[PDB]
Amino acid sequence: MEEAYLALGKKILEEGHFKEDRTGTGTYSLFGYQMRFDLAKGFPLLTTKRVPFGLIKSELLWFLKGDTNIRYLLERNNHIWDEWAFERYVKSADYQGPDMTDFGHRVLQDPAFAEQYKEEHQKFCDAILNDAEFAEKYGELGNIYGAQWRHWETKDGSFIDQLANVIEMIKTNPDSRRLIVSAWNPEDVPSMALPPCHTMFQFYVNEGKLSCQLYQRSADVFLGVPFNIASYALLTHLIAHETGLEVGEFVHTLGDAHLYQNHVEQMQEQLSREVRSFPTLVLNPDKASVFDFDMEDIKVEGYDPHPTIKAPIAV
């Protein structure tokens, strides 16, 4: 239930110890947590703040087609992965704009700089969208989720389609204790723009219901987890659709669960709001495979959230 998510935020506010982090933002953090969502009780898109489903859909579909270039996202007005690509670009020999070192913090502190970053970021998005040589070089994030799900590269010149294999094993071997997809590929991790935050997931089938457990090594509680929960709930629904199953539970297991220190007022504001009913997922009945779904084939209905709560992403 949404309550389980809100209790996590509250526990971190109360007892999450301060921890320096890679991003230089600083976090309050706990280690080891588990939340369960019964998918039969509604689609888990949070109601205590508006969570944009279109972004969640486009990101999942991008994962599912095995794509690790941000061009596909930009064409669907999804900018959630922009900063890491832009970061690679501004560190490259080809960038010749104003200095962008530490842009992630500097935009919050210095408005003249915020305006330069907005200008450079606009030119970057334009070039990815319109210049295919530029897209190919600078849209690339390395072998992140899409690549490992669809195209885990083997030692003898091939690739494993892990996710398609797990879907097929659910159909013919539902009681398998190995229905696993891992994005943690030790060889590719160093050249990934980020190692996988949502790291490994496992399926389970009982009395015609499909459940999914995600192990998430690193969880951005305010900004990222709402996306992650909906993303894996959507995936479980797509797979249940293809395999002719009903949906069971999504179980979300966390390693370093953290609230960024500049998300604290936002989380507090969120905790002051009454929970509403989760919406309902609607999927196009005519699509057979998970890999056949496009944007128009997936919607959420009866979604009536409290207003958007804005917060800065830690780069």
Add this chain to the structure above:
Amino acid sequence: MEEAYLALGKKILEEGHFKEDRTGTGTYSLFGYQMRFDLAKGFPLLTTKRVPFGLIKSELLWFLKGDTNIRYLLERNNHIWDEWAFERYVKSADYQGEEHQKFCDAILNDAEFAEKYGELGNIYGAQWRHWETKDGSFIDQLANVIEMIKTNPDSRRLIVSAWNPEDVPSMALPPCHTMFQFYVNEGKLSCQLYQRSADVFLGVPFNIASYALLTHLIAHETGLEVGEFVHTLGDAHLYQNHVEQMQEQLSREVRSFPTLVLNPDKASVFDFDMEDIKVEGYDPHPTIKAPI
């Protein structure tokens, strides 16, 4: 707390799902579970039944040094990895139809025979310390994670994976312990294990002591105190013929966990052997026997 392990056994008895596999083996299972052991409260070797710690520690030591040859285990009277070696040998060319002992002696008293017949393949030692890459080099995940703990303790990337989808469909025993993660705060090291598949009566008690000991060994190597071992399960199943054993165990009063003692006069755990790891004040209820 031991109470957390007992609560899992009780919940499985009360509401686990029954399944019968292709050969008649019944289980009661649930999916997605998490237990926490605060290692400052004592070392989680179960008190409601005797769990033999010798075998746990020679096994764990064997993984830690990345050894995949069973000679190290036999020297220490650990026989749990013997079948997928003796089975191999009797199907080889040089065999002629107790014979197990002749095999065990040769592994021990003949070097070449050990390399030829004592070598297991792709198991924990190899995955943790010697993960093969495309160009034929190797990543030592565990040694890397240790250095990261010393130099970058705030890291959210302290991960060791045992899961390669290239290798899994091919292996006799794909790893039950799929990955684990360390965490450091306030001078204390914690560890979370993700376990895809858990034999609740027979395996989980061994698994808990094994990862608790690992956390202690890494803490020792890194100059840290111990925090918690967090045990996350995927498919947690109680075999149908372990039900009476689980019920007997649940009838027994919990006692205080013992205290783990490591040789202080020895700096690196890569030089640890059996005598460097001790358990004090272990006072458990009797062994509960069960079909494997």
